[PDB]
Design a protein around this ligand. Structure first.
Ligand SMILES: NC(=O)c1ccc[n+]([C@@H]2O[C@H](COP(=O)([O-])OP(=O)(O)OC[C@H]3O[C@@H](n4cnc5c(N)ncnc54)[C@H](O)[C@@H]3O)[C@@H](O)[C@H]2O)c1
Ligand SMILES: NC(=O)c1ccc[n+]([C@@H]2O[C@H](COP(=O)([O-])OP(=O)(O)OC[C@H]3O[C@@H](n4cnc5c(N)ncnc54)[C@H](O)[C@@H]3O)[C@@H](O)[C@H]2O)c1
Lengths: 283, 283
């Protein structure tokens, strides 16, 4: 049984997960490095909950009822309390390793250790823990409370039992889990991101205007957002880096980053987060 | 002014266009090779119109009012009547050429000749007519009455005037036109179809189940349909052929068809149209 979920990292993704567990009545032990980071974690869960109140989504008593289940710590031994720990602090490799080893040292042999990540090899991480068969990848989606799926990524070592447990936890949290063998871009980024890249290739070659490329794809394929606009939301620096990973990990030019993508990144035109990428934004 | 539109071909796409012109009060001269094909063209416009009646979309009098404007011929000299002729009979090259030359012979020098096509080089076709600057590509979308966009594809020769006229005609028909320099896959198929191909690559490599790949993309990127399901609707034979065109026309393995795609095609598992492709269907 998994009634208590360890969480390391209390940022966007961390509360994300904590909330998702808590509104289901699971006990979360959320760990960060200050008291500032922890409570600030608790503020966005409160604020988010307060938004749900205000559009007739259940309810005042549950807002209260979820939060009680969140034990927000700063010491790391609190995770002996826990059925499973999810790391969710960093896309930095060396740092990620450290965190997982520290986690590996505290919790008992049979506890499952997961790591949220978009790009990092789940197999390589699993190998740094003393029980690799108890390790598995998760990838949650970027507004976590509402987004109804998770990629569950098996390292080469991830056992079937580790898999079914997390698979069930995910279904519990009310998400549809997707199982994927560890592979660059897993499933989602693997197919989506080279499409974004092809849009840049089209824009790069002068074939059409951006706006028209984007309308092409909205109206033609009934995509909610156009790939260029979407790139501007994700971050072209985030896009370029995914493509560089595909190209490096596969060692195959099929995944060349688009050149215009490289140029915008070099220039600092990174999308909405700098006010300019493919399109210009208001600031 | 463009008040009378030539149409060669009275199949799915042909009526498609005719209707779209007629419900706007444009005079269509629709030409096919039998009287069977012509009237059968007129039947699907009637049937489609009768569906619109039945969901409170205007109206009995307009159903009547559109049809009057459709002059359905079988002789080819009827197209001297016309401001512009759109070919819409065939994706066969040699045949396409013939039709356009025949059309080129009838109509006057200043009449615009277009060709609907997903894959055929608009430049190469424009070159077979005596006035290439009066030639342009269209690509309409596959349920034409409702689909609100057209790709407008300039051959190297297409003049600006030819372009603006058709651009305006398109806006008239109530569609958003997309302008594209002639290039394999234009814009839409160029970015969409290699994404479908990447899904097959993922399925091909054993990374995930189809259903999960498809859910990955629906829920993750809010795509209406999943790429594999979509491939099953388009036809895997139609998919493979688009990829083969990309690979052949660019002469670049970046667009390798996925191997699983090749195998399903070789096997006859072509999607919904044979009852089996990626998934199995009821027949
Ligand atoms: N946000 C995204 O774009 C995104 C998308 C998919 C996956 N991810 C994954 O999730 C991770 C977390 O991203 P986020 O959006 O929550 O970041 P964020 O900037 O919102 O917050 C990161 C949090 O991690 C904490 N942290 C850093 N080092 C730590 C340590 N040694 N121990 C405990 N906590 C530590 C920080 O104090 C901070 O509160 C990413 O690094 C990435 O691996 C992120
Ligand atoms: N349907 C699609 O999947 C699709 C999608 C995009 C573009 N297109 C383009 O549009 C073309 C038409 O496809 P469709 O779906 O209307 O086909 P269809 O099978 O519904 O009908 C084709 C029609 O063209 C007519 N035709 C054939 N040869 C002719 C000639 N020499 N003169 C006059 N008419 C002739 C036939 O009699 C028939 O009525 C395709 O070949 C392709 O170039 C098709």
């Amino acid at each position: 049984s998994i009634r208590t979920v360890g969480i390391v990292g209390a940022g966007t993704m961390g509360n994300g997960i904590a909330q998702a567990c808590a509104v289901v009545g699971l006990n979360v032990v959320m760990v960060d490095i200050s008291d500032a980071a922890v409570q600030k974690g608790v503020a966005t869960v409160a604020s988010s909950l307060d938004r749900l109140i205000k559009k007739e989504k259940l309810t005042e008593a549950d807002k209260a009822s979820a939060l009680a289940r969140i034990k927000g710590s700063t010491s790391y031994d609190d995770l002996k309390a826990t059925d499973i720990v999810i790391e969710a602090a960093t896309e930095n490799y060396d740092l990620k390793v450290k965190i997982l080893k520290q986690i590996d040292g505290i919790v008992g042999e049979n506890v499952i250790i997961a790591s949220n990540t978009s790009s990092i090899s789940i197999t390589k991480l699993a190998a740094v823990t003393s029980r690799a068969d108890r390790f598995i990848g998760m990838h949650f989606f970027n507004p976590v409370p509402v987004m109804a799926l998770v990629e569950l990524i098996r390292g080469l070592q991830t056992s079937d039992t580790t898999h079914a447990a997390v698979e069930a936890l995910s279904k519990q949290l009310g998400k549809y889990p997707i199982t994927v063998k560890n592979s660059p871009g897993f499933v989602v980024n693997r197919i989506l991101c080279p499409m974004i890249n092809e849009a840049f290739c089209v824009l790069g070659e002068g074939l059409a205007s951006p706006e028209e490329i984007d309308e092409g794809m909205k109206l033609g394929c009934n995509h909610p957002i156009g790939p260029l606009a979407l790139a501007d939301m994700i971050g072209l620096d985030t896009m370029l880096a995914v493509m560089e990973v595909l190209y490096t990990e596969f060692a195959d030019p099929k995944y060349r980053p688009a050149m215009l993508m490289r140029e915008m990144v070099a220039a600092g035109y990174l999308g909405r987060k700098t006010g300019r990428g493919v399109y210009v934004y208001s600031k």
